[PDB]
């Protein structure tokens, strides 16, 4: 009964842009990973810090479910020690992440005949993001010596760029929904278990 609502995350009708990575908190519920085991439609399923198998026999203080959307080529980028647009300007991981990562194409859902541009990504930022940092600031980037006084143009760019997702897009360019399931265990009682 007291089962963790992972379904609403993976079966969510809509997702967020990567720069605005959506988060869910999971606590005080039974940890049922069978949905992952049964679900064979996972494009990529890679864990770190702990094996996915001996998890339903293991407790933790809390669980964090990160969700966002990228393209196929950026799937490799969702991991520790990764570099790239998504790695540094839209989402990040520490050098000691403990959890799992899942990715699956959503071209049938996250693409339009006219192109699905609802999902965006940060393309510029004066410094790399800190681990598990979310940035949605609408500040105009200063690319040149001339300050950008809230206006766009020369050396003044909109930080967000919209993805081009269409049914005809390439595999590396078709949309993919990505989830990060992180388990935290501190010197506190664990309210979630298998």
């Amino acid at each position, epitope marked *: 009964t007291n089962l963790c609502p992972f379904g609403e995350v993976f079966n969510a009708t809509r997702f967020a842009s990567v720069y605005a990575w959506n988060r869910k908190r999971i606590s005080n519920c039974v940890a049922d990973y*069978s949905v992952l*085991y049964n679900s064979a439609s996972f494009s990529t*399923f*890679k*864990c*770190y*810090g*702990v*094996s*996915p*198998t*001996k998890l339903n026999d*293991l407790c933790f203080t809390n669980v964090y479910a990160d969700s966002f959307v990228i393209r196929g080529d950026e799937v490799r980028q969702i991991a*520790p*020690g990764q570099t790239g647009k998504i790695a540094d300007y839209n989402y990040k991981l520490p*050098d*000691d992440f403990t959890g799992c990562v899942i990715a699956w194409n959503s071209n049938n859902l996250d693409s339009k005949v006219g192109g699905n541009y609802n999902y965006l990504y940060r393309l510029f930022r004066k410094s790399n993001l800190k681990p598990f940092e979310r940035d949605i600031s609408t500040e105009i980037y200063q690319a040149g010596s001339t300050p950008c006084n809230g206006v766009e143009g020369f050396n003044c760019y909109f930080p967000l760029q919209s993805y081009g997702f269409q049914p005809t897009n390439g595999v590396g360019y078709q949309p993919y929904r990505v989830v990060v399931l992180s388990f935290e265990l501190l010197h506190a009682p664990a309210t979630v278990c298998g």
Partner: antibody
Amino acid sequence: EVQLVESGGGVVQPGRSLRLSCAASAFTFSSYDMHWVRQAPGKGLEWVAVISYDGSNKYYADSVKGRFTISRDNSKNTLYLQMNSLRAEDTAVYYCAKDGGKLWVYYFDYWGQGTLVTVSS
Amino acid sequence: DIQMTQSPSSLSASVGDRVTITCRASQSISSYLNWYQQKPGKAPKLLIYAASSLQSGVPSRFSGSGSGTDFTLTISSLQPEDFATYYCQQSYSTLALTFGGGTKVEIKR
């Protein structure tokens, strides 16, 4: 005192299928996960796939993901390894290995003697 | 992904000498490293797990240390039966495990 017996190894043409058997003894085959490790001639070790203790969770290496199959029968304490549509790259020595379950991270505790598999047209 | 470099590729040592082997990773792992031993022809065998834990039935001369990217395996006093090839394998990547290139130890004659 742990005994493992690989069997079913042999030679076949590329694109065919082969079944390999690991026989468990002197331990609870049902209460530990199993890994398959292959080592090409002259090279070192190469991880392939792993199965849970209960046989409900399955995982494979990217190099063979969607091409191999791992299954087990705890009643018989037997471990089955099916390899469909084999490539020349698959010629190596296979070993079966126990889980150990001593950590949240996988180590390798025991190994069998291994069996040889070759692919050639 | 993750790559493991084991050094030296091969070393010459005699009985009673203290041997040290280094294994390095592309990125950092806390203690997700193992050392295994495999004689020529014989099947692989485990020596050390977690990089800081002696396996049961293994002589005390084998000792493991290091964390993050660099790990060391040290033998206080070499023995004739220890002349084998040692593999260092990372465990941080459960579903994409990778092993070291190997380090074959010969007799220093």
